[PDB]
């Protein structure tokens, strides 16, 4: 469920735990640690409580599948023409008006200062 915000928060814990008792009697692998520092530096959120709650609000108020939420949130489209051209599952649908989607775009815009 952690896409950009909660994923970064938990990675600070292991880095904060690494400084304590860094010695290890076993053999460690450096590939796994490199995959964490070089992938999460693309997009980062500010606060955890108000970000994870806001993205889950359209799930209850509107009808969106679990797989559709992940792709839209990661892409973070800045217009209405892009969301109707990326995912082919939104073609020829009238369930949700575009105006509430535009309002949600503004709501996502104020979160990122």
């Amino acid at each position: 469920c952690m896409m950009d915000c909660e994923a970064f928060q938990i990675l600070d814990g292991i880095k904060g735990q690494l400084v304590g008792l860094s010695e290890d009697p076993s053999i460690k692998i450096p590939v796994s640690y490199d995959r964490a520092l070089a992938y999460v530096e693309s997009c980062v959120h500010y606060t955890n409580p108000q970000s994870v709650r806001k993205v889950l609000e359209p799930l209850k108020t509107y009808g969106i599948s679990d797989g559709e939420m992940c792709v839209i949130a990661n892409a973070s489209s800045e217009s209405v023409d892009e969301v109707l051209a990326f995912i082919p599952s939104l073609k020829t649908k009238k369930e949700v008006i575009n105006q509430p989607l535009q309002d949600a775009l503004e709501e996502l815009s104020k979160l990122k200062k």
């Binding site: 469920c1 952690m2 896409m3 994923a7 938990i10 990675l11 292991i14 290890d24 009697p25 076993s26 053999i27 460690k28 692998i29 590939v31 796994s32 490199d34 995959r35 964490a36 070089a38 992938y39 693309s42 997009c43 679990d66 797989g67 992940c70 792709v71 990661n74 892409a75 489209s77 023409d81 892009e82 051209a85 990326f86 995912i87 082919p88 599952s89």
Partner: protein, 174 residues
């Protein structure tokens, strides 16, 4: 699809260190770390980093060879699934005549084919080839979003290789 699903395991612990009952939990987590570290790969699941939450542990089964004991432990962890129809950004590493390299993290290698982006002529007048024919400059370090396709896997390395397509909108860096 970053759903944290459970994954049982049958990690075996050597009899080299079996003591300190008051601190036995310290040895259990260390053995668990060395379990996925040895493999560090998957076929159709993805990748795992750290065992953040441990759900439960099982009874210690003793197998009579080289003094080995097994422990069944079920826990949840971070996983990533490259589902079809996902817009994931990535950084470019090097530019070549064929197979443009795109690095969406060191966990996998992504190659760019010729029939993925708009038609253009490679510029040989400078050191790195440019694709500024459609008013867009792409270099190393710039984040470019693209749609993912079906991924392949190997036999030994089992690398999650995939193909990058720029047929969608919002192409180039943002």
């Amino acid at each position: 699809m970053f759903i944290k699903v459970k994954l049982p395991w049958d990690v075996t612990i050597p009899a080299e260190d079996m003591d300190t009952g008051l601190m036995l939990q310290r040895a259990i987590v260390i053995r668990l770390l060395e379990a996925f570290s040895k493999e560090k790969a998957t076929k159709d699941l993805g990748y795992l980093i750290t065992p953040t939450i441990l759900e439960n542990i099982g009874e210690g089964k003793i197998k009579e060879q080289t003094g080995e004991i097994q422990f069944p432990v079920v826990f949840n962890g971070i996983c990533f699934k490259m589902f079809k129809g996902e817009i994931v950004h990535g950084v470019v590493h090097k530019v070549h005549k064929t197979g443009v390299f795109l690095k969406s993290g060191p966990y996998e290698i992504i190659y760019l084919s010729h029939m993925k982006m708009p038609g253009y002529e490679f510029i040989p007048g400078e050191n790195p080839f440019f694709m500024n024919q459609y008013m867009s400059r792409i270099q190393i370090g710039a984040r470019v979003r693209f749609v993912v396709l079906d991924t392949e896997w190997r036999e030994a390395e089992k690398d999650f290789m995939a193909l990058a397509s720029i047929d969608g909108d919002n192409l180039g860096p943002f």
